[PDB]
Amino acid sequence: GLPTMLTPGSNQFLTSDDFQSPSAMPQFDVTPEMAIPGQVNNLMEIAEV
Amino acid sequence: GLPTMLTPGSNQFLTSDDFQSPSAMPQFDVTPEMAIPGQVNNLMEIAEVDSVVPVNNTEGKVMSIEAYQIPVQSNSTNGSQVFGFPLIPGASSVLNRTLLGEILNYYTHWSGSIKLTFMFCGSAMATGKFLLAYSPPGAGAPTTRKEAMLGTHVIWDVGLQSSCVLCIPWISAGGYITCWYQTNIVVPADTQSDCKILCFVSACNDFSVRMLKDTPFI
Amino acid sequence: GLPTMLTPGSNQFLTSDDFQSPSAMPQFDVTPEMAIPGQVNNLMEIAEVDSVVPVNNTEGKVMSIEAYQIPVQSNSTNGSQVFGFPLIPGASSVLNRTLLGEILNYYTHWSGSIKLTFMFCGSAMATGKFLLAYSPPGAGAPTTRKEAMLGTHVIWDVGLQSSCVLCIPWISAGGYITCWYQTNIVVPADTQSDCKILCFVSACNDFSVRMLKDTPFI
Amino acid sequence: RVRSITLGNSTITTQECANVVVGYGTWPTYLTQPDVATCRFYTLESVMWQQSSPGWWWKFPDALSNMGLFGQNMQYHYLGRAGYTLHVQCNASKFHQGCLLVVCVPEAEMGCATIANKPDQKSLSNGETANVFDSQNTSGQTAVQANVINAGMGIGVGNLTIFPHQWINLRTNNSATIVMPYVNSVPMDNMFRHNNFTLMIIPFAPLSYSTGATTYVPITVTVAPMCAEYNG
Amino acid sequence: NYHSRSESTVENFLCRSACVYYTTYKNHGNFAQWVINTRQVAQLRRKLEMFTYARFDLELTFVITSSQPVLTHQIMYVPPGGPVPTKINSYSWQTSTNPSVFWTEGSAPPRISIPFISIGNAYSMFYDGWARFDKQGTYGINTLNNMGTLYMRHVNDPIVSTVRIYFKPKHVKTWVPRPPRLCQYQKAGNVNFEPSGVTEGRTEITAM
Amino acid sequence: NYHSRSESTVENFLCRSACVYYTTYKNHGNFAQWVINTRQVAQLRRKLEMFTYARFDLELTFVITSSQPVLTHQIMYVPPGGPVPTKINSYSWQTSTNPSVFWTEGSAPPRISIPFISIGNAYSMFYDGWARFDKQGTYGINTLNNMGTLYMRHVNDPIVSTVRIYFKPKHVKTWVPRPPRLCQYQKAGNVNFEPSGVTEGRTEITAM
């Protein structure tokens, strides 16, 4: 295969990380989003009330 | 080599995954596909095929072909019920072993419309009327012919049509199907037996299923 | 480094795999290829070469060159069988040690056509006719010259042609080859011995094999 | 009106308006040594439908195995292939009632009455003679578990509609026509050790009649092979 | 590719992993074996038997654990027609045409792919015929459905091993739908059944 | 590339892995060795001997297990003409022109590739001649067929090791086809045979 080296940080679990992961249910057909009134995108929208 | 890091999830076997794997026999020359009639691409192609519904599945009828035969008597009280059944989706007793029922029993959730066909099998010269009524979910089954008549229904005259087709919603009380003897069956001559009605069911249109599970029938 | 995950199958040795590997001697200057006559690209190039068939492989003939010599007698009963053999693919006794047979014995499945050549080795002035008959799979070998004559056949006159070629299917009862003395062999003078026939076999056309296995001859 | 159909030296009639079912939407075609000398109608002995009849079946390559030239072509060849048109008709009056399912089932492998055993050749097929379904559980060491409700296969009989079929309701029709394509895992096969399909005729509504009427209804099955092929 | 589609499609219905075989083998006494089959598990068998013919590739994953150096295990696949071992040291374990996987504990589980391998163009779920016409014991046996055999041994020169074989059909094509089985299964080698009622019973034919 | 082709092609016929050598060595007493050869295994030998000349590269995979820290093993390849060890501590183990592989247990098996390395343009399966004309013991010895030697030792300063060597020819070219051997093999260093019958016997020359 392709030559590689493992670097420090390999096989560690960082609670702050951001990596892809496999789905346990890749074949599941997910329910579509419908509009719901009141969508919140930021907490400042609450702080400003 | 190229610097890499192993992330969480490395070296685990997920029974649901989708990764490439090496062939044990990469040099094997695989037999070409030939056309075979009857290719199935989707299970809805099976759910949409009409099958006979065991409506008369009483305790002494289940082990016989008679389970599928709804009796009709020429000397019945007018206005009495001929037959009827709950369209309960949970363990539908007359619809869960049908081609439709078997497929829906592999999913945790489903929704769509159902086609119900009723076929009269009396003699060619037999005539009379039946009232086929539909009771929407939450309405309750009717108790009399008049109550059924004031709801949603069709008058089926067997002297004009050997069969009648209803189209109802079915999702998952669940609604009901009833049939009343508006009139009795008039014949030109005595017969040695009664008349029968056969019932058929299939998925009507845009039927969908959502999450595969084990069948409860094993 | 670059985030990665190891999947099932990682760190296993599959004897059938195909991966790159490092050279133990990357700096070695390798001797260039020169043309050599006789390059073989495919084993069918060998299977298609005619080889001599040990038709007369009786118990006392197998250890001699005589195994390949079919006897012909000038005083035979007319209509009697000269020779014959099963075209059984499973352990074909007269065809499985031939160039063709050896190659086919390395595969679990094969199919194609076979060329059979019969060569007469009597004197130049010898003449007479032979009946070469073919019995399709499931037909059974013929018992008489007339039965053979009413089937599929060729009349081979050794006074016109020193050899005759048949082309038959062979896959894997398996069909049969027979040869009958339509007439005896007529000669101008007495000889001190009989006449012989040699038989040759090869793959005829579009011969294919499907799955490599160990030879059964070791 | 009435349509007269001639194949070879045999002629049958059907209603001009009769419906034809083509199994799987496929017509038989050629891929071999063709033989059209057998492309004639073969009419099987009629069976009588009574008030209590449980049903009948035929294995096809076997049903025609004694039929003259068709039977001979099976006997003189190693491999072969064929499609079939099956015509099923009832002779009944307007004073008769009842309903049949006429269905062709591919690979109808049947179960044995004794769980530990396998059914024999005659219990599975009696050639051109119809085999009969039972209303009761059958019994025997090599007997087929012919109880009607499971169609001999361990399935519910009401679900046989998944296979090519036509209903015969005597108040509307007395006939069915099914075109059955060649269906297999291989292009050609041995026709003596494998039954490509089974024809089953099963009443779902019992025969009944007025009191002065004939007490039985004849059911006639006519078979017409198409595109027959054999090894050279 | 295939997964972002309705769960009603044939590939989503059938392309799911299942544990099809559980066994054990020891380092002293000695090997495990399994003939690849589709009639081994009732849920899998029932779904496949809704079709008459099918064509698919096989994915096999092995979960291997052990109980009392690095322990190495050998998994051997014998294609239809190949030689098989009878002994822990039979010559067939070294045959070049019988692919093997050598694996050690602590690594990700072994995994191999076996392509569609029948001589015919599809595997037959049902067979209304005989391997030999005059042999009653051959009714229902289609010799074109041989998918090969797996063998497992410990590689060395009081340890007990346990093996779980996970099977998944892939790229599945099916033909000629059949009714779902009503009866419970009796044997893997047959279609024998106990006659069974078409459905559950009711006390009356009317709606209430 | 090569695999998606007929199994009748030369590369598919010959490019299959085989176990060609099985041995042992201990950490006390001390090393294993194998001279690379093609006449070691009868099935391999027979297939290669259907040709007169061949040119190929070699792939070598080592399956190593052991029985009573991390255990390290050294695999050394000595090219034709290189020095060889006689002792566990011979200087030849450190020669820069004798490539070595250092490997530890628990990792994927060691693997190396050896290119075609003869001085001639092909390896000869047969040789109708002598290395030295007047020396009868040299008949059949072609000195151009030296593929080098492998040595194995445990790296340290009552453990028993076992080694299985897996060999696979690659990128194989062959010339001048020969008849398959009829006789059974007697020795790896010869073409000696016991005279053997051309085929199996029959009771009569006729069809039945």
PDB file of N, CA and C in Angstrom, chain E residues 30-67:
ATOM      1  N   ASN E  30     -10.413 -30.449  15.536  1.00  0.00           N
ATOM      2  CA  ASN E  30      -9.443 -29.375  15.774  1.00  0.00           C
ATOM      3  C   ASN E  30      -9.672 -28.119  14.898  1.00  0.00           C
ATOM      4  N   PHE E  31     -10.606 -28.156  13.921  1.00  0.00           N
ATOM      5  CA  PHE E  31     -10.908 -27.022  13.034  1.00  0.00           C
ATOM      6  C   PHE E  31     -12.397 -26.872  12.850  1.00  0.00           C
ATOM      7  N   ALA E  32     -12.798 -25.662  12.525  1.00  0.00           N
ATOM      8  CA  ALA E  32     -14.189 -25.359  12.286  1.00  0.00           C
ATOM      9  C   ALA E  32     -14.485 -25.306  10.817  1.00  0.00           C
ATOM     10  N   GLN E  33     -15.731 -25.566  10.457  1.00  0.00           N
ATOM     11  CA  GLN E  33     -16.118 -25.418   9.071  1.00  0.00           C
ATOM     12  C   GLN E  33     -17.559 -24.999   8.904  1.00  0.00           C
ATOM     13  N   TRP E  34     -17.834 -24.328   7.799  1.00  0.00           N
ATOM     14  CA  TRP E  34     -19.183 -23.922   7.441  1.00  0.00           C
ATOM     15  C   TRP E  34     -19.396 -23.916   5.942  1.00  0.00           C
ATOM     16  N   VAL E  35     -20.436 -24.595   5.485  1.00  0.00           N
ATOM     17  CA  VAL E  35     -20.748 -24.597   4.067  1.00  0.00           C
ATOM     18  C   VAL E  35     -21.587 -23.377   3.834  1.00  0.00           C
ATOM     19  N   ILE E  36     -21.206 -22.544   2.890  1.00  0.00           N
ATOM     20  CA  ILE E  36     -21.921 -21.307   2.742  1.00  0.00           C
ATOM     21  C   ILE E  36     -23.318 -21.597   2.276  1.00  0.00           C
ATOM     22  N   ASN E  37     -24.271 -21.017   2.978  1.00  0.00           N
ATOM     23  CA  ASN E  37     -25.665 -21.260   2.741  1.00  0.00           C
ATOM     24  C   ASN E  37     -26.487 -20.022   3.026  1.00  0.00           C
ATOM     25  N   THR E  38     -27.674 -19.995   2.448  1.00  0.00           N
ATOM     26  CA  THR E  38     -28.658 -18.937   2.606  1.00  0.00           C
ATOM     27  C   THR E  38     -29.898 -19.394   3.352  1.00  0.00           C
ATOM     28  N   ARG E  39     -29.944 -20.674   3.699  1.00  0.00           N
ATOM     29  CA  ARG E  39     -31.073 -21.258   4.408  1.00  0.00           C
ATOM     30  C   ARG E  39     -30.776 -21.486   5.882  1.00  0.00           C
ATOM     31  N   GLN E  40     -29.622 -21.003   6.299  1.00  0.00           N
ATOM     32  CA  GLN E  40     -29.101 -21.135   7.655  1.00  0.00           C
ATOM     33  C   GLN E  40     -29.893 -20.357   8.730  1.00  0.00           C
ATOM     34  N   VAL E  41     -30.392 -19.172   8.371  1.00  0.00           N
ATOM     35  CA  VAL E  41     -31.095 -18.257   9.269  1.00  0.00           C
ATOM     36  C   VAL E  41     -32.511 -17.994   8.793  1.00  0.00           C
ATOM     37  N   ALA E  42     -33.506 -18.179   9.654  1.00  0.00           N
ATOM     38  CA  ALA E  42     -34.892 -18.003   9.225  1.00  0.00           C
ATOM     39  C   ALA E  42     -35.257 -16.608   8.714  1.00  0.00           C
ATOM     40  N   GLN E  43     -34.735 -15.525   9.295  1.00  0.00           N
ATOM     41  CA  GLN E  43     -35.140 -14.212   8.769  1.00  0.00           C
ATOM     42  C   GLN E  43     -34.546 -13.959   7.395  1.00  0.00           C
ATOM     43  N   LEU E  44     -33.310 -14.395   7.192  1.00  0.00           N
ATOM     44  CA  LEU E  44     -32.634 -14.216   5.921  1.00  0.00           C
ATOM     45  C   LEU E  44     -33.258 -15.097   4.872  1.00  0.00           C
ATOM     46  N   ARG E  45     -33.531 -16.340   5.256  1.00  0.00           N
ATOM     47  CA  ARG E  45     -34.105 -17.301   4.364  1.00  0.00           C
ATOM     48  C   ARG E  45     -35.447 -16.821   3.886  1.00  0.00           C
ATOM     49  N   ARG E  46     -36.279 -16.325   4.799  1.00  0.00           N
ATOM     50  CA  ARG E  46     -37.585 -15.860   4.415  1.00  0.00           C
ATOM     51  C   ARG E  46     -37.537 -14.710   3.438  1.00  0.00           C
ATOM     52  N   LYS E  47     -36.645 -13.738   3.642  1.00  0.00           N
ATOM     53  CA  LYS E  47     -36.595 -12.628   2.709  1.00  0.00           C
ATOM     54  C   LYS E  47     -36.112 -13.064   1.324  1.00  0.00           C
ATOM     55  N   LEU E  48     -35.097 -13.922   1.266  1.00  0.00           N
ATOM     56  CA  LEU E  48     -34.591 -14.384  -0.023  1.00  0.00           C
ATOM     57  C   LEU E  48     -35.597 -15.245  -0.755  1.00  0.00           C
ATOM     58  N   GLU E  49     -36.384 -16.023  -0.022  1.00  0.00           N
ATOM     59  CA  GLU E  49     -37.374 -16.907  -0.616  1.00  0.00           C
ATOM     60  C   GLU E  49     -38.613 -16.205  -1.141  1.00  0.00           C
ATOM     61  N   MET E  50     -38.646 -14.877  -1.089  1.00  0.00           N
ATOM     62  CA  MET E  50     -39.725 -14.134  -1.700  1.00  0.00           C
ATOM     63  C   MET E  50     -39.447 -13.965  -3.183  1.00  0.00           C
ATOM     64  N   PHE E  51     -38.318 -14.490  -3.650  1.00  0.00           N
ATOM     65  CA  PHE E  51     -37.877 -14.433  -5.030  1.00  0.00           C
ATOM     66  C   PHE E  51     -37.589 -15.853  -5.496  1.00  0.00           C
ATOM     67  N   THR E  52     -37.527 -16.089  -6.802  1.00  0.00           N
ATOM     68  CA  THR E  52     -37.256 -17.448  -7.248  1.00  0.00           C
ATOM     69  C   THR E  52     -35.797 -17.549  -7.630  1.00  0.00           C
ATOM     70  N   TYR E  53     -35.268 -16.492  -8.227  1.00  0.00           N
ATOM     71  CA  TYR E  53     -33.884 -16.506  -8.654  1.00  0.00           C
ATOM     72  C   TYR E  53     -33.217 -15.277  -8.090  1.00  0.00           C
ATOM     73  N   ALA E  54     -31.934 -15.380  -7.777  1.00  0.00           N
ATOM     74  CA  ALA E  54     -31.203 -14.211  -7.314  1.00  0.00           C
ATOM     75  C   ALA E  54     -29.757 -14.259  -7.713  1.00  0.00           C
ATOM     76  N   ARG E  55     -29.192 -13.106  -7.920  1.00  0.00           N
ATOM     77  CA  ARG E  55     -27.798 -12.992  -8.257  1.00  0.00           C
ATOM     78  C   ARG E  55     -27.163 -11.957  -7.356  1.00  0.00           C
ATOM     79  N   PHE E  56     -26.145 -12.338  -6.603  1.00  0.00           N
ATOM     80  CA  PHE E  56     -25.494 -11.403  -5.687  1.00  0.00           C
ATOM     81  C   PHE E  56     -24.065 -11.775  -5.359  1.00  0.00           C
ATOM     82  N   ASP E  57     -23.310 -10.802  -4.852  1.00  0.00           N
ATOM     83  CA  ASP E  57     -21.961 -11.030  -4.346  1.00  0.00           C
ATOM     84  C   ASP E  57     -22.044 -11.182  -2.830  1.00  0.00           C
ATOM     85  N   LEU E  58     -21.079 -11.849  -2.223  1.00  0.00           N
ATOM     86  CA  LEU E  58     -21.067 -12.045  -0.779  1.00  0.00           C
ATOM     87  C   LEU E  58     -19.954 -11.327  -0.027  1.00  0.00           C
ATOM     88  N   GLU E  59     -20.306 -10.630   1.036  1.00  0.00           N
ATOM     89  CA  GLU E  59     -19.286 -10.043   1.894  1.00  0.00           C
ATOM     90  C   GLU E  59     -19.244 -10.805   3.213  1.00  0.00           C
ATOM     91  N   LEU E  60     -18.068 -11.301   3.588  1.00  0.00           N
ATOM     92  CA  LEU E  60     -17.925 -12.060   4.829  1.00  0.00           C
ATOM     93  C   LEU E  60     -16.962 -11.429   5.831  1.00  0.00           C
ATOM     94  N   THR E  61     -17.466 -11.155   7.037  1.00  0.00           N
ATOM     95  CA  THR E  61     -16.665 -10.551   8.112  1.00  0.00           C
ATOM     96  C   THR E  61     -16.599 -11.534   9.273  1.00  0.00           C
ATOM     97  N   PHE E  62     -15.414 -11.715   9.829  1.00  0.00           N
ATOM     98  CA  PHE E  62     -15.251 -12.696  10.894  1.00  0.00           C
ATOM     99  C   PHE E  62     -14.939 -12.121  12.264  1.00  0.00           C
ATOM    100  N   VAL E  63     -15.782 -12.376  13.247  1.00  0.00           N
ATOM    101  CA  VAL E  63     -15.474 -11.877  14.581  1.00  0.00           C
ATOM    102  C   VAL E  63     -14.935 -13.050  15.377  1.00  0.00           C
ATOM    103  N   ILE E  64     -13.664 -12.971  15.729  1.00  0.00           N
ATOM    104  CA  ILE E  64     -12.987 -14.083  16.369  1.00  0.00           C
ATOM    105  C   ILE E  64     -12.455 -13.696  17.724  1.00  0.00           C
ATOM    106  N   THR E  65     -12.793 -14.479  18.736  1.00  0.00           N
ATOM    107  CA  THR E  65     -12.281 -14.237  20.078  1.00  0.00           C
ATOM    108  C   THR E  65     -11.726 -15.542  20.612  1.00  0.00           C
ATOM    109  N   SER E  66     -10.961 -15.484  21.693  1.00  0.00           N
ATOM    110  CA  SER E  66     -10.377 -16.699  22.247  1.00  0.00           C
ATOM    111  C   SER E  66     -10.169 -16.636  23.750  1.00  0.00           C
ATOM    112  N   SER E  67      -9.924 -17.805  24.328  1.00  0.00           N
ATOM    113  CA  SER E  67      -9.658 -17.972  25.750  1.00  0.00           C
ATOM    114  C   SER E  67      -8.680 -19.121  26.016  1.00  0.00           C
TER     115      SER E  67
END
